[PDB]
């Protein structure tokens, strides 16, 4: 059934966790070293 997966997508805590992961995955991009490739 597609109803079970639909409820999780349109949830209150699931959409917050995926949103805080997006703004935290960006910080992983800013911390990279551009000079030393092998670090
Ligand atoms: C968890 C991620 C996505 C957000 C936090 C990222 C920052 C705060 C973390 C990610 C990897 C970490 C680095 C991993 C390895 C080292 C080498 C060590 O000799 C000095 C600290 C240093 C340089 C860490 C500093 C903190 C660091 C840059």
Swiss-Prot record:
Subcellular localization, as worded in the UniProt entry: Membrane
Signal peptide (residue range): none
Membrane spanning stretches: 13-31
Tissue expression summary: Expressed in pancreatic islets and in brain, where it has been seen in cerebral cortex, hippocampus, basal ganglia, habenula and thalamus. Expressed in the small cell lung carcinoma cell line SCC-9. No expression in skeletal muscle.
Domain of life (superkingdom): Eukaryota
Domain notes: Each of the four internal repeats contains five hydrophobic transmembrane segments (S1, S2, S3, S5, S6) and one positively charged transmembrane segment (S4). S4 segments probably represent the voltage-sensor and are characterized by a series of positively charged amino acids at every third position.
Functional description taken from the UniProt entry: Voltage-sensitive calcium channels (VSCC) mediate the entry of calcium ions into excitable cells and are also involved in a variety of calcium-dependent processes, including muscle contraction, hormone or neurotransmitter release, gene expression, cell motility, cell division and cell death. The isoform alpha-1D gives rise to L-type calcium currents. Long-lasting (L-type) calcium channels belong to the 'high-voltage activated' (HVA) group. They are blocked by dihydropyridines (DHP), phenylalkylamines, and by benzothiazepines.
Disease entry from the Swiss-Prot or TrEMBL record: Sinoatrial node dysfunction and deafness: A disease characterized by congenital severe to profound deafness without vestibular dysfunction, associated with episodic syncope due to intermittent pronounced bradycardia.
Family statement: Belongs to the calcium channel alpha-1 subunit (TC 1.A.1.11) family. CACNA1D subfamily.
Subunit structure: Voltage-dependent calcium channels are multisubunit complexes, consisting of alpha-1, alpha-2, beta and delta subunits in a 1:1:1:1 ratio. The channel activity is directed by the pore-forming and voltage-sensitive alpha-1 subunit. In many cases, this subunit is sufficient to generate voltage-sensitive calcium channel activity. The auxiliary subunits beta and alpha-2/delta linked by a disulfide bridge regulate the channel activity. Channel activity is further modulated, depending on the presence of specific delta subunit isoforms.
Protein name: Voltage-dependent L-type calcium channel subunit alpha-1D
Organism: Homo sapiens
Residue range from the parent sequence: 875 to 913 of 2161
């Amino acid at each position: 059934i597609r109803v079970g997966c639909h409820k999780l997508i349109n949830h209150h805590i699931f959409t917050n966790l995926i949103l805080v992961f997006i703004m935290l995955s960006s910080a992983a991009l800013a911390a990279e070293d551009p000079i030393r490739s092998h670090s």
